[PDB]
Write a protein that binds this DNA or RNA. Structure first.
Ligand code: CL
Ligand code: CL
Ligand code: CL
Ligand code: CL
Ligand code: CL
Ligand code: CL
Ligand code: CL
Ligand code: CL
Ligand code: K
Ligand code: MG
Ligand code: MG
Ligand code: MG
Ligand code: MG
Ligand code: MG
Ligand code: MG
Ligand code: MG
Ligand code: MG
Ligand code: MG
Ligand code: MG
Ligand code: MG
Ligand code: MG
Ligand code: MG
Ligand code: MG
Ligand code: MG
Ligand code: MG
Ligand code: MG
Ligand code: MG
Ligand code: MG
Ligand code: MG
Ligand code: MG
Ligand code: MG
Ligand code: NA
Ligand code: NA
Ligand code: NA
Ligand code: NA
Ligand code: NA
Ligand code: NA
Ligand code: NA
Ligand code: NA
Ligand code: NA
Ligand code: NA
Ligand code: NA
Ligand code: NA
Ligand code: NA
Ligand code: NA
Ligand code: NA
Ligand code: NA
Ligand code: NA
Ligand code: NA
Ligand code: NA
Ligand code: NA
Ligand code: NA
Ligand code: NA
Ligand code: NA
Ligand code: NA
Ligand code: NA
Ligand code: NA
Ligand code: SR
Ligand code: SR
Ligand code: SR
Ligand code: SR
Ligand code: SR
Ligand code: SR
Ligand code: SR
Ligand code: SR
Ligand code: SR
Ligand code: SR
Ligand code: SR
Ligand code: SR
Ligand code: SR
Ligand code: SR
Ligand code: SR
Ligand code: SR
Ligand code: SR
Ligand code: SR
Ligand code: SR
Ligand code: SR
Ligand code: SR
Ligand code: SR
Ligand code: SR
Ligand code: SR
Ligand code: SR
Ligand code: SR
Ligand code: SR
Lengths: 172, 337, 160, 142
RNA sequence: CGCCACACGGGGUAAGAGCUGAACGCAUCUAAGCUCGAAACCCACUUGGAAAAGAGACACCGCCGAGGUCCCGCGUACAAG
RNA sequence: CGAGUGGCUUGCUACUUCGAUGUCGGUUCCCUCCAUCCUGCCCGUGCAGAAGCGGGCAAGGGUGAGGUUGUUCGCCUAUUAAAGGAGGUCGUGAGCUGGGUUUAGACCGUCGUGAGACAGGUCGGCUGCUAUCUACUGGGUGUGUAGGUGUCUGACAAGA
RNA sequence: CUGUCCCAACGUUGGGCCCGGUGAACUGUACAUUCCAGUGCGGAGUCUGGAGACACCCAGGGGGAAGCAAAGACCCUAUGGA
RNA sequence: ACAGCUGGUUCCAAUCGAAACAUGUCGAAGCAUGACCUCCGCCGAGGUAGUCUGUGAGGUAGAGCGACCGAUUGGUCCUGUCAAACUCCAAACUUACAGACGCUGUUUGACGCGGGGAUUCCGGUGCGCGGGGUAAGCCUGUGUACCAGGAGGGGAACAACCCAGAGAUAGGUUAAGGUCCCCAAGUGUGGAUUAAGUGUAAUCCUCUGAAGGUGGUCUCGAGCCCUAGACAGCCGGGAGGUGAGCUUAGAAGCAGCUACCCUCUAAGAAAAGCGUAACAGCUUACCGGCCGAGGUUUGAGGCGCCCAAAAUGAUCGGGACUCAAAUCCACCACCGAGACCUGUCCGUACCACUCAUACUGGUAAUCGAGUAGAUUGG
């Protein structure tokens, strides 16, 4: 089996061993793609994922790889967008971005500020009651995006009642 | 069913044998944060007295109120960092690369050492710098020692030599800081590394108890009720079960108790000084009259009077430093009442 | 008692009631189920539960499975539904238990089992092509209550 | 320090056991062998379980003792020892004439024995002897 | 029976929460890959530890003299040693 | 109803010991198992909260003091975060105890013609030995590494 | 009433330890530095596999030698005894 | 003192070589008589451990029972089940006699008969067949080979499992088993599976792993659909008569009830599933579109995963091993006994010669292990 990826005109693919770096006018995403007997490579403008094997396990990763690169294309061109809306009921929650780590204060009336660190280049930007995580690396973005929603995780009290927390609203 | 009970005595300080060097040897030094500096000093236990202070704890309601606190007196006269040892990083931990010495030695350093006659400091130093240049210089420690002779209470003149790490600044900077100190006479005082209010780590070799039984050594019960008349009083129930057909080394047994190295943590330096301010009427029992360089270390200190105690900036501090506590009263009251 | 005690055929045949007395009555309620008025051949589909291993199934396991199996067919097809299941095995093997010591160890009659060699129909249903998927579930619950693993062979039905 | 080794072997990307089997073999023939870059050697399988075995081998012991290496350095050495009658005369000699090293303390590149190498392009489930060591608690001195 | 001191933090997981993600165009926490996560594991801290047979490192002193024993006075040591 | 794991109860067997492997309970001291009572992190709820109920990961630490009975067991009290269970010759008598069982004395009930009996009760009724080996706790003398002093390293080992 | 206990401490006298002198006995198939498992007449220092282990000596408390001491009192058996 | 009880009973060698069972026994820890072991004398040509055929004996397995028998289903002949103490049937196999063949005997005298001497009557294990018991390293039968009384090789160790029965010595080839190291011989060949360190454990007290479950992966077949564009996903449309009727204040796809009918059209239900008090609003069928190649349903096999908790230190003997040093299908070359072959000597048995049982010469594929015991030379 063998699949090919014609990289878009904005994009610049490049490989070194197992690692593949993708460049666009939005950013650059380097990613390692490693699996038994699946070989990825650049042929001028196309990316070639090929393997002499054709077993479901081998095919599973072939498929996975493609999307990882295709996403990298979109990442370095248009980028990834995750939208969030901070929500609070009785306690006025404060969500800001201190340095390189989105922070949340006075959650459920806490004196202790909860804070996660930002994954990679990902850009967390607040606009009142909305937050927008973006970037070329869906991996870092999708994670940082999730990181925020998770940070307001509660388990000792009924969530159906206690819902204060920043939530993801838009997935790219 | 037989109630539960924690085992008698701790297994961490084993084996409980006599110590090799009556002079403590730290096995862990402070992290490199501040400016280049030596990481510890030493002295000699003098005795105990109390002192009154003004509560430093910003959290305690007692803050501002007087408070009586016990204190061990330790004469800590100036030591001499006679050398500088360098460590190269090899596949088998650190190894002494080379040392740099001096000219001006203490008149009686030969009582324990084979004092140098022909050393090549500048060259040796080169070796260190070429190794740092190569990126193999590990940590920098200074061979140090005391002037027991300075302390009268202590009979020994024959100096106590011990190495101490230097850290803080960047490898280069502290390296020079070392050499600077050494390239003089190595003289330095406790105030050259400490300041009243700072928590330190005092290590020492415990008081000599000789062989003692399980009861005293491992804190095991004595035979009780009727069991204390049949001919068994401080002997334990047994040495183990049928099988394992052996005596496990974890059962409390008779042995050498005391003269062990101990590193007593977070000892707050209540006051560093010099003079006869802490001395007692009649003299510190089985020691003598204090007059000169010293430290008032809060609480107990491992070891008996005249033993070499070693200091070190607290490797694991719990609270925040309250530099220079207001010492209102230091007891001069006799220790023979 | 654990089926382990009588699941294997490792005793002579014990049936001659003309010699054995005090044998406990069968816990098996019925052997014919559904509409015993209608004929087996009056049905398009015929599925059986084949025991894969040679065993001895005590009447209690027989009744217990036969029960929960039919109770499903009655559930999913109604009491007076169109179907007819059958249990073609009967407990003849009289079981005993040495309940002294090993002195005079012949046991006293305790139960009854049906010796079933592997590759046999313990049950056999008869239904229309649509009910079959229930008639199968009725068997899955059946073989769960009998020691050996089983097959479910559609002996009549090329409709699917 | 100096070790007049007849053979110098490079364990980088090579199946520990297989390499050991040969070193101990040669050693039993009067071959002063030297294993190099052992930290970069490798053993196939689920790291999770490959670790348990070596991590368990640490927990085992008592007054008599059951010392077990942790440095990738050691592991290899003991492995090799397990392929030689290290109790016997002949064996002690052979085992003692074999030494393992972290990285290459020599000049010469170490040769690679046949069949002993792995291909990362065909394998994903294997472990660096050093990774094992790092996990055991060892301080990465390599 | 008095008095003094006895962490945090890191690292890797479990159960668990998740991310990107294919076999299966969707879907999916997993199959490759990744973020987190237990008083438990490693580290950290204390103790011992050149007899570690790969039996170690450094500095100095000395091979006709470095140093040590003996002896004598005694304990911060001690059942002999 | 069916399938199993364990080896703690009981039972079966009679392989092992009758030129003797000391009993039950207790006690003291050390190691362990997890089928986890508490403590940590978790899932579900008939989860508002609070206090719970069920479940997962988890054996680091903890799991105490007392009243009756020789009891093991168990019953009871008051505290507790909880007052978990099991293995180690039902751990431990060249350690202790000796209350129960189970000698020789004696009484009562029962049975017995009687001696006397009891898978009934009751009072009383003994605890040897100087450690050769090995094992572990500590303490020395030598040989090896191959002149001396001082300072180190850190494979390894221990901890709750 | 009290150290029986909580919960152990210090002390006293005689031993215990070193030295002179005197000077036995119990025990001994052999080998024997052991541990962890396994195996075996199913309860191994000695077999199998591993691990560990330089020799000698002092003091100790007794885990093991199913330690030593008594041809089991318990049980049954004997064409035994009283 | 007596003891049917325990302990001991002293030199070499050569031939043979058990019984641990039967009957009776105040007998079961013993004896006697048999079986069996051994020795002596006698007789004098047959013998029968194997097989084949012939003439006879037989009712266990299996099967079957409108063939007896006694059990054991339901239905308005039909239909469901059984048997140690049942049988209309019925083996394999066991067994009498005889012939043949093989083997054996007539200087090694068989077969047999008479006499002396025993030992032995706690057995055990494997496999087959059993009976008992939940089971057992259990109890009790039976046939058989083996341990006991059997070495040597393998199996980690290990009476009875595999090879193998064994005078000395020597050369050689194999057997069981093994060839990555430990450890002699392959890191052998062609190929496929396994990703759990599954596994690397013939048999077993000893090596577990079960019922149930498994879009883990691999291979094989069958029905159906599909470039007249399938499977899925996204977009698109999902129209009126009329809120179906009744029910009812109201019910309008969607409480219950009965029907479930025709228009437009490329579709569109008297509504499959949520939603409201009922309307609303949201999907499902149904149609179109985009896209572009296989898709869906089912049967069987292989390896694996889960189910899976125990007490001083984990394990296939250890190391450690992953296109293997695992598993399966085949293949190639080796290693590996005291077996088999082979030279020499020895012992014994027999033959020739001989007074000899002293020599010498010859034969042994069909002689060479052994506890109790019998016999015998030293
Ligand atoms: Cl006691
Ligand atoms: Cl250990
Ligand atoms: Cl060996
Ligand atoms: Cl792999
Ligand atoms: Cl209380
Ligand atoms: Cl034979
Ligand atoms: Cl493994
Ligand atoms: Cl002779
Ligand atoms: K006994
Ligand atoms: Mg709550
Ligand atoms: Mg005083
Ligand atoms: Mg006073
Ligand atoms: Mg004993
Ligand atoms: Mg658990
Ligand atoms: Mg624990
Ligand atoms: Mg009593
Ligand atoms: Mg006991
Ligand atoms: Mg004892
Ligand atoms: Mg005793
Ligand atoms: Mg009494
Ligand atoms: Mg009397
Ligand atoms: Mg005694
Ligand atoms: Mg006796
Ligand atoms: Mg008697
Ligand atoms: Mg009499
Ligand atoms: Mg003889
Ligand atoms: Mg002879
Ligand atoms: Mg039959
Ligand atoms: Mg015998
Ligand atoms: Mg070889
Ligand atoms: Mg396994
Ligand atoms: Na006494
Ligand atoms: Na005992
Ligand atoms: Na009876
Ligand atoms: Na270890
Ligand atoms: Na943590
Ligand atoms: Na079991
Ligand atoms: Na006891
Ligand atoms: Na615990
Ligand atoms: Na009690
Ligand atoms: Na015992
Ligand atoms: Na006792
Ligand atoms: Na006693
Ligand atoms: Na007293
Ligand atoms: Na002992
Ligand atoms: Na008498
Ligand atoms: Na007699
Ligand atoms: Na007898
Ligand atoms: Na017999
Ligand atoms: Na008899
Ligand atoms: Na013939
Ligand atoms: Na049969
Ligand atoms: Na035999
Ligand atoms: Na053998
Ligand atoms: Na394995
Ligand atoms: Na491996
Ligand atoms: Na003989
Ligand atoms: Sr130090
Ligand atoms: Sr240290
Ligand atoms: Sr006493
Ligand atoms: Sr033992
Ligand atoms: Sr049976
Ligand atoms: Sr089943
Ligand atoms: Sr997870
Ligand atoms: Sr040394
Ligand atoms: Sr809990
Ligand atoms: Sr009991
Ligand atoms: Sr009771
Ligand atoms: Sr106990
Ligand atoms: Sr008593
Ligand atoms: Sr009585
Ligand atoms: Sr030597
Ligand atoms: Sr003693
Ligand atoms: Sr014979
Ligand atoms: Sr027969
Ligand atoms: Sr080889
Ligand atoms: Sr190969
Ligand atoms: Sr192959
Ligand atoms: Sr066993
Ligand atoms: Sr098996
Ligand atoms: Sr199964
Ligand atoms: Sr567990
Ligand atoms: Sr012979
Ligand atoms: Sr013979």
């Amino acid at each position: 089996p063998r699949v090919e990826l014609e990289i878009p005109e904005d994009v610049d693919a490049e490989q070194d061993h197992l690692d593949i770096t993708v460049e666009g006018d939005n950013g650059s995403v380097t990613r390692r793609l490693w699996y038994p007997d699946i070989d990825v490579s650049v042929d001028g403008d196309t990316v070639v994922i090929e393997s002499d094997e054709d077993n479901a396990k081998t095919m599973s990763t072939i498929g996975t790889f493609q999307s990882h690169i295709e996403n990298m294309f979109h990442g370095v061109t248009e980028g990834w967008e995750y939208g969030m809306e901070v929500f609070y009921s009785h306690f006025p929650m404060q969500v800001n971005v201190e340095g390189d780590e989105v922070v949340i204060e006075n959650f459920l009336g806490e004196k202790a500020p909860r804070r996660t660190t930002i994954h990679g280049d990902t850009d967390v930007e607040i606009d009142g009651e909305e937050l927008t995580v973006s970037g070329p690396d869906i991996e870092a973005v999708g994670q940082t995006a999730a990181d925020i929603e998770q940070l307001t995780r509660i388990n000792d009290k009924d969530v159906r009642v206690f819902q204060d927390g920043v939530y993801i609203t838009r997935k790219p | 069913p037989q109630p539960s009970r924690p085992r008698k005595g701790s297994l961490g300080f084993g084996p409980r044998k006599r110590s090799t060097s009556e002079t403590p040897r730290f096995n862990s030094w402070p992290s490199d944060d501040g400016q280049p500096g030596v990481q510890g000093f030493a002295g000699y236990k003098a005795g105990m007295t109390h002192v009154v202070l003004v509560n430093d704890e910003p959290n305690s309601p007692r803050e501002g109120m007087e408070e009586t606190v016990p204190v061990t007196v330790i004469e800590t006269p100036p030591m001499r960092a006679v050398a500088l040892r360098a460590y190269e990083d090899t596949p088998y931990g650190q190894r002494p690369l080379t040392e740099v010495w001096t000219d001006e030695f203490h008149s009686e350093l030969d009582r324990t050492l084979d004092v140098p006659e022909d050393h090549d400091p500048d060259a040796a130093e080169e070796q260190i710098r070429d190794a740092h240049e190569a990126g193999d210089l590990g940590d920098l420690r200074l061979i140090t020692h005391t002037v027991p002779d300075a302390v009268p209470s202590v009979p020994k003149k024959k100096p106590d030599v011990m190495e101490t790490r230097v850290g803080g600044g960047s490898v280069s900077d502290r390296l020079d800081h070392a050499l600077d100190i050494v390239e003089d006479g190595g003289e330095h005082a406790m105030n050259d590394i400490f300041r009243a209010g700072e928590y330190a780590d005092v290590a020492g070799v415990t008081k000599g108890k000789g062989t003692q039984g399980p009861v005293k050594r491992w804190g095991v019960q004595k035979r009780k009720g009727k069991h204390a008349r049949q001919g068994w009083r401080r002997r334990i129930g047994n040495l183990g079960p049928w099988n394992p057909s052996r005596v496990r080394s974890t059962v409390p047994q008779q042995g050498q108790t005391g003269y062990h190295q101990r590193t007593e943590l977070n000892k707050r330096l209540i006051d560093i000084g010099e003079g006869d301010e802490p001395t007692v009427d009649g003299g510190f029992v089985n020691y003598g009259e204090v007059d000169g360089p010293y430290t008032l270390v809060k609480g107990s200190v491992p070891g008996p009077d005249k033993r070499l105690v070693r200091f070190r900036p607290a490797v694991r501090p719990n609270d925040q430093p309250r530099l220079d506590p207001e010492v209102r009263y230091v007891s001069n009251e006799s220790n023979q009442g | 008692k654990p089926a382990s005690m009588y699941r294997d055929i490792d005793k002579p045949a014990y049936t001659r009631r003309e010699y054995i007395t005090g044998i406990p009555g069968s816990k098996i309620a019925q052997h014919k189920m559904g509409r015993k008025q209608k004929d087996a051949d009056d049905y398009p589909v015929q599925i059986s539960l084949i025991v894969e291993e040679t065993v001895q199934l005590r009447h209690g396991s027989l009744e217990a499975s036969r029960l929960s199996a039919n109770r499903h067919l009655i559930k999913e097809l109604g009491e007076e539904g169109d179907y007819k299941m059958t249990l073609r095995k009967f407990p003849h093997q009289v079981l005993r238990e040495n309940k002294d010591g090993m002195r005079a160890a012949f046991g006293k009659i305790v139960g009854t089992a049906a010796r079933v060699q592997a590759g046999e129909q313990l049950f056999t249903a008869y239904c229309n092509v649509e009910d079959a998927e229930h008639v199968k579930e009725a068997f899955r619950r059946a073989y769960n209550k009998i020691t050996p693993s089983c097959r479910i062979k559609v002996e009549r039905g090329e409709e699917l | 320090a100096e070790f007049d080794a007849d053979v110098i072997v490079d364990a980088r990307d090579c199946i520990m056991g297989r390499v050991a089997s040969q070193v101990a073999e040669q050693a039993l023939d009067g071959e002063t062998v030297a294993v190099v870059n052992a930290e970069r050697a490798v053993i196939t399988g689920r790291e999770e379980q490959i670790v348990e075995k070596y991590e368990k081998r640490v927990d085992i012991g008592n007054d008599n003792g059951y010392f077990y290496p942790k440095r990738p350095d050691g592991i290899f050495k003991r492995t090799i020892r397990g392929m030689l009658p290290h109790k016997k005369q002949r064996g002690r000699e052979a085992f003692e004439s074999v030494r393992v090293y972290l990285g290459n303390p020599y000049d010469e590149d170490g040769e690679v024995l046949d069949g002993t190498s792995l291909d990362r392009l065909s394998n994903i489930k294997f472990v660096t002897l050093g990774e094992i060591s790092e996990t055991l608690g060892a301080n990465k001195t390599w």
